[PDB]
Design a protein around this ligand. Structure first.
Ligand code: FAD
Ligand code: FAD
Lengths: 391, 391
């Protein structure tokens, strides 16, 4: 087969890029290693920034989101003793965030694509990338036990952390920046009404807790755990007691509990690769960078990479301005690094780190007290949380 | 002898407290271990916050400062590539900082005291504190080889880091929080015109540099150095070349050099003791807490402790409200911890730390880029630099 742009991975990144390109008249084929329900089984993200909200609208996939997503104008931080609200809307100059599940976003994009009849190959096994620096790169994959070749002009690597894209670039061409945190988040998806109309981030001596939601009758809760914990060790009951133990008493008392729909432990990491391209291959989303979940930025960054890639390819195709594609990595990395710093910061102030001396503990408290206390400090949080402008 | 308030240390803290109390009608005696010129030989501080400026006025010792100190409405940060100005005045809502040497402040206070004829004992050796928890505490000291006893109602420990005050409290009564940085600052006092009308903090790959001043024909420069360096190893020339190597080219080219008046290496440290009192003993300034020089806060914090102690003692003496003295430590520590966090932050973003991975380096850069870039971030710096409100 032959196409314009070949996309590796049928996650939100590949799907959204695919959608935007199709609608713009640029043919693209998506190659996914797994099945459509495997993809749809990932819970992940709950919070979208306005830019991603706008991109979905632009891909013409926002009906359901407009109906079903919840607009939030504030978030709360609870730290030893109190509960503080950050008014996002007023502090960011009128911006908000939207709660809409990653699974939901993914489902909407898969439907839109299916309708349009754009090509998607599920269970594409053994994807391999070839001739990245030539004029004519191609992708090989196996469909059954048949190896097919897809010819294209450009490859978008939208295959997440463990994809093949990043792996296909000469190791010597990339500079890696990684931070591994000594803790993960145990998440619990329950068909219970959320404890608050807004999110609650909690710094507690026993460790971080987060009260999030999916809808009015669907909640998502997380507690920080050591990397050595196995989820088979966390019954629903154990989860509920522990959560309750990390929250403000008035919050724990109002908490409606119930059986889990899903439970999983996610390890926290910081990761950036520079540059994010090679020849005719362009990395986007988790393939190029990972942020700890704390600042609700991963999917939001994939969206900014995708927005940048899409606009650059349009220009190349419709305007014959292929040279601007050289500017892809410079553009995305300005945004990445600022989102990674916010994410690191959020992570360092709300989590309980092992082997922390008295000083470092006290500074942790003071940062909270300072930032939650000053109009300037509050504003720093608010403008980062809502998302910084797209370039 | 007998007095009301005995003060240990004839540094800025003890002198200013002494001055404020004398003028208010509360007799006080100051006991200093060293001579008056030894004290006057310390260079130290260049930057005063408006609150300390106001306190000096209130002690009626501001003639010379009003004439000779320089009002600064901005500071600059130079980091890999650029030079950024923080407009303090506009970002803090109209506040500025004053450049007036610690030595100058000290000289003015010593003169004012001498004029007033309030008691000061220089070369008071072997000071010892007794009966802190009684109704009648006293101080013993040796004048020659004669041990005298001073009876008083209260003791103010204004004896700096190494004083006897802090040492006199049951170790078990205090909680210590300390951070030792792996670097010091080599300072150079030169009778040369400063390179800029405003301060320049520089983050350079070879390490931090600071361009400060004392007057229009008096400059103070510092470069970060390892703790193993001995100043005997830093000729003036060596200092000048190294400084020049850490600054923006346009700044290094305009630099007027000359022989040093003083050269000294100061190690950086973070230190707080909780509580800051015991019985009839009250700690103030460096006796209770140390901040790295980076945020220009040490002397400024001594001033806030002293302002708090003075107002509490007035109330106790003139209003018979001795109970409020219990609130001394609570009041001061709110301010200390916020100044210590700013000081730590400033220190972590401008200095070159050994064994720093690629990630941590990049985040260091991003913090600068973020904070120097956002109106909210700039404001956070500005309100902290000028000094947060006194409680
Ligand atoms: C606990 C948790 C909470 C989160 N919360 C949020 C939040 O609230 N807001 C937010 O912004 N972000 C959050 N994120 C981040 C967000 O979920 C991810 O950034 C997002 O999944 C990235 O999308 P992606 O399309 O780049 O990658 P992925 O979602 O990983 O999808 C990549 C696709 O490529 C496929 N693939 C992999 N290898 C190959 C191969 N060789 N060939 C073919 N296909 C392949 C995969 O099967 C997958 O379908 C969260 C993440 C976690 C873990
Ligand atoms: C390089 C450098 C730069 C600085 N820059 C600034 C700046 O720009 N702005 C700012 O705010 N701060 C800055 N500081 C901090 C500031 O200099 C100190 O915080 C200030 O000296 C504290 O005053 P103090 O009176 O508490 O103590 P000190 O100045 O230490 O004086 C204490 C006095 O007590 C005496 N003493 C000690 N032990 C005894 C004893 N047993 N008996 C009797 N007397 C005793 C000492 O001899 C001394 O005279 C800087 C410090 C350094 C090192």
């Amino acid at each position: 087969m032959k196409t314009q742009v070949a996309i590796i991975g049928a996650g939100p990144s590949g799907l959204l890029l695919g959608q935007l390109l199709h609608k713009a008249g640029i043919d693209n084929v998506i190659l996914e290693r797994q099945t459509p329900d495997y993809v749809l089984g990932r819970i992940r993200a709950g919070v979208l920034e306005q830019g991603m909200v706008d991109l979905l609208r632009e891909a013409g996939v926002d009906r359901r989101m407009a109906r079903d997503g919840l607009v939030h104008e504030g978030v709360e931080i609870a730290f030893a003793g109190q509960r503080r609200r950050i008014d996002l809307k007023r502090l960011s100059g009128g911006k908000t965030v939207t709660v809409y599940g990653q699974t939901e976003v993914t489902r909407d994009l898969m439907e839109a694509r299916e309708a349009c009849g754009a090509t998607t190959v599920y269970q594409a096994a053994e994807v391999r990338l070839h001739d990245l620096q030539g004029e004519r790169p191609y992708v090989t994959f196996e469909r059954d036990g048949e190896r097919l070749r897809l010819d294209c002009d450009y490859i978008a690597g939208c295959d997440g952390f463990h994809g093949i894209s990043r792996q296909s670039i000469p190791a010597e061409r990339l500079k890696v920046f990684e931070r591994v945190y000594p803790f993960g988040w145990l998440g619990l998806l329950a068909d219970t009404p959320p404890v608050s109309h807004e999110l609650i981030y909690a710094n507690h001596p026993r460790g971080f807790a987060l009260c999030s939601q999916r809808s009015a009758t669907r909640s998502r809760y997380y507690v920080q755990v050591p990397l050595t914990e196995k989820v088979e060790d966390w019954s629903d009951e154990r989860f509920w007691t522990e959560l309750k133990a990390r929250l403000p008493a008035e919050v724990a008392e109002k908490l409606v509990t119930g059986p889990s729909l899903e439970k999983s432990i996610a390890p926290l990491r910081s990761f950036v690769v520079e540059p994010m391209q090679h020849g005719r291959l362009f990395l986007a989303g988790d393939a190029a960078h990972i942020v700890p979940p704390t600042g609700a930025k991963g999917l939001n960054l994939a969206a900014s990479d995708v927005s940048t890639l899409y606009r650059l390819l349009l220009k190349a195709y419709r305007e014959g301005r292929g040279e601007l594609l050289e500017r892809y990595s410079a553009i995305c990395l300005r945004r990445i690094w600022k989102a990674e710093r916010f994410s690191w910061w959020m992570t360092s102030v709300l989590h309980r780190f092992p082997d922390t001396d008295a000083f470092s503990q006290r500074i942790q408290q003071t940062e909270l007290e300072y930032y939650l206390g000053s109009e300037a400090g509050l504003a720093t949080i608010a403008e980062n949380y809502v998302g910084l402008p797209y370039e």
